[PDB]
């Protein structure tokens, strides 16, 4: 998910701006539900996740809000020491303790119905999620928000009812799960909060690994909200986020793999810093760039170019590749909708990267790549690969500088050889067919909730909805899109609601509908 908030000094109009882009996948019916809510002293328009009695992306009379997943450290796994005589007992604070036991029945549709029974266990730390019987260990899972999910619902409802920074910040302080919250108001203020209840951990443990559950390494309460990363009206004049790190010294234990030097939020940083004052049209251009960028270009294309230039006197193919790489705008886009990405050299670069990643790590991590490929080739960045290829300090010496340069060159020669064999020598012949997607029947909760849609759209690294909001003195104004459509109803006879997928064309074509707030405008929409 991505987000931007723009303060009054960085906005062309002098009004604070907000941009939302939650990434929750693409399904039909959609993951989001758009609504307008109006009662005395409470007027709000926007969307929330399906089933939520509150708006998460949108604006009330006074403020606009959005959110991105925090990736803060709110889950810890405890390694329970089991009694070798009784595997339902674990050692905790000096004595054997009994696990809580629960029998659950599952009715399974054949075919007729079957009845399955399973037993589930709880320790003082939480549910037992895994067993290492060979080590006489059970793993239990502690959530910092266990039992406070309803308090988080209440905090979001209070954010909807809030009228100013103080009230919004009070709601933020009550939210117990790990999110980033973003705020913009009609007075020009912006604010950022990394919300959640973060535990005070033992200083004797490495928080990248499970904690021993014997009682000496328990959480010691939660830190005050004032210690959560947060800022009102930051000096830079704006905040951008694409699930990246909140602040320099904020840690998230086992999931640090998402907060490295190479991070996809660079696309938003680059776009804001390339501009002076901005408007909503500028924010949309930045979303477009982020949505189509080949994210490895930011750090890896300069490295590739520099390497090829050292040898273009030897290899006559390298000067051509350098020219094509330099002119390429780093996007995989299809502006003419002809079904092929517009830059042929992007196909080369994709294959170069795949070859390079494999050569970098196959001979050391190949044997663990079932766990490490998702780290070293992560969708948010490839920090370790960049450090190895650029010669920057690492704890392990993965490759000498000479070996790293040979990898870059060999990956180039292999990618070019394959393209020359199968397509030809001119980059225009290398253009790859676009990847497409549909709004399907199964969301991230991994169960079917409908029948989906067969309409194919180009893949975009983009929010599942977008709001663009300007907090003008009169009211929030702007535009948005909430694909595939508002209404998920399919009649028994097969007739789809007229509003089942009538926003897919808007989404696919970078068009939007007006953000409605004034009742006089609502009646004429």
């Amino acid at each position: 998910s991505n987000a931007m908030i723009i303060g009054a000094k960085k906005s062309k109009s002098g009004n604070a701006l907000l941009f939302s882009g939650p990434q929750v996948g693409f399904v039909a019916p959609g993951f989001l539900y758009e609504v307008g809510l109006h009662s005395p002293g409470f007027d709000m328009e926007g969307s929330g996740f399906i089933g939520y009695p509150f708006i998460m992306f949108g604006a009330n009379q006074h403020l606009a809000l959005t959110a991105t997943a925090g990736y803060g450290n709110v889950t810890d796994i405890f390694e329970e020491k089991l009694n070798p005589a009784n595997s339902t007992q674990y050692f905790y604070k000096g004595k054997w303790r009994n696990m809580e036991k629960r029998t659950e029945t599952f009715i399974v549709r054949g075919g007729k119905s079957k009845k399955i029974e399973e037993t589930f266990f709880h320790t003082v730390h939480g549910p037992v999620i895994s067993l290492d019987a060979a080590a006489n260990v059970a793993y239990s899972k502690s959530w910092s928000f266990r039992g406070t999910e309803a308090k988080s619902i209440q905090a979001y409802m209070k954010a909807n009812w809030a009228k100013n920074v103080k009230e919004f910040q009070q709601a933020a302080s009550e939210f117990t799960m790990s999110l980033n919250w973003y705020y913009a108001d009609k007075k020009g203020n912006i604010a950022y909060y990394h919300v959640g209840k973060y535990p005070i951990r033992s200083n004797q443990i490495d928080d990248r690994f499970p904690t021993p559950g014997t009682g000496e390494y328990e959480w010691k309460g939660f830190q005050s909200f004032a210690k959560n990363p947060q800022a009102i009206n930051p000096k830079k004049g704006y905040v951008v986020n694409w699930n990246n790190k909140p602040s320099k010294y904020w840690r998230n234990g086992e999931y640090s793999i998402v907060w490295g030097k190479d991070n996809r939020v660079q696309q938003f940083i680059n776009g804001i810093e390339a501009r002076g004052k901005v408007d909503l049209k500028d924010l949309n251009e930045i979303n477009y760039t982020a949505s189509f960028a080949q994210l490895r270009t930011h750090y890896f294309k300069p490295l590739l170019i520099k390497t090829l230039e050292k040898y273009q006197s030897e290899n006559k193919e390298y000067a051509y590749l350098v020219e094509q790489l330099r002119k390429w705008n780093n996007l995989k886009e299809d502006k003419n909708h002809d079904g092929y990405y517009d830059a042929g050299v992007a196909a080369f670069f994709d294959e170069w990267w795949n070859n390079t990643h494999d050569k970098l790590f196959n001979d050391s991590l190949g044997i663990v790549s079932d766990l490490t490929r998702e780290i070293t080739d992560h969708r948010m960045g490839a920090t370790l690969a960049y450090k190895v290829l650029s010669g920057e300090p690492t704890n392990y010496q993965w490759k000498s500088a000479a070996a790293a340069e040979k990898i870059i060159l060999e990956s180039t020669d292999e990618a070019l050889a394959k393209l020359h064999k199968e397509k030809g020598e001119e980059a225009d012949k290398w253009r790859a067919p676009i990847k497409t997607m549909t709004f399907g029947a199964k969301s991230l909760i991994a169960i079917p909730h409908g029948y989906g849609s067969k309409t194919e759209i180009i893949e975009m690294n983009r929010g599942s909805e977008n709001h663009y909001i300007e907090m003008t003195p009169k009211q929030p104004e702007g535009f948005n899109v909430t694909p595939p459509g508002q209404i998920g109803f399919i009649h028994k006879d097969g007739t789809l609601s007229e509003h089942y997928e009538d926003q897919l064309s808007l989404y696919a074509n970078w068009k939007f509908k007006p953000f409605l707030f004034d009742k006089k405008d609502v009646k004429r929409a």
């Binding site: 089933g51 399974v108 309803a150 690994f209 990246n244 909760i445």
Partner: protein, 196 residues
């Protein structure tokens, strides 16, 4: 079009988005649940089944292990009710009103099923059940917890152990520190420390 459900005016715009005009929050949040159910009842039903671990009743053995994980890590109705009982009384009442609105549509749909129950209910041969406020909390938990819940600590222990047994501890520790770092001080941040 403009319509009146009880004491709440519902204006649906050209994209079908409902705009609710109520005289108080109790009426508003009932209408909120009602229009959501009008538009999305089968989706709400299945999301709730996801959290309860009862999808396999509809879609079969392929979802049994998912149902088992959901019940393993989830809460009983009584536990969720205890959560609701700890909220501000007005907030709890509005969540109850939201569930009453969903239920109002369920009751309307089951009485006129051929016109108001969506095709998926007919094809899969079952009826939607009525809702309580605990079910609204289940809708929240089924999606929001996904973004909070992970077992990477266990993956990391396995990475380190598998590296150790092949490369030895000293080299495995250095490799792991490059894979899963303690703090990359060069990672781009949304705010600077002076802004706190």
């Amino acid at each position: 079009d403009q319509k009146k459900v009880e004491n709440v005016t519902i204006i649906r715009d050209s994209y079908g988005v409902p705009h609710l005009y109520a005289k108080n929050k109790k009426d508003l949040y009932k209408a909120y649940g009602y229009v959501m159910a009008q538009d999305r009842l089968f989706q709400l039903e299945m999301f709730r089944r996801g959290n309860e671990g009862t999808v396999s009743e509809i879609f079969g053995e392929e979802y049994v292990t998912k149902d088992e994980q959901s019940r393993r890590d989830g809460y009983s109705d009584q536990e969720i009710q205890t959560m609701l009982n700890g909220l501000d009384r007005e907030t709890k009442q509005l969540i109850e009103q939201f569930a009453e609105g969903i239920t109002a549509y369920v009751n309307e749909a089951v009485k006129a099923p051929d016109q108001k129950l969506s095709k998926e209910f007919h094809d899969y041969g079952f009826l939607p059940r009525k809702w309580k406020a605990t079910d609204v909390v289940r809708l929240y938990m089924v999606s929001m917890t996904y973004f909070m819940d992970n077992h990477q600590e266990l993956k990391n222990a396995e990475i380190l152990a598998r590296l150790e047994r092949t490369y030895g501890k000293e080299k495995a520790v250095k490799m792991f520190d490059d894979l899963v770092w303690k703090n990359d001080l060069e990672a781009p941040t949304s705010i600077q420390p002076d802004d706190q």
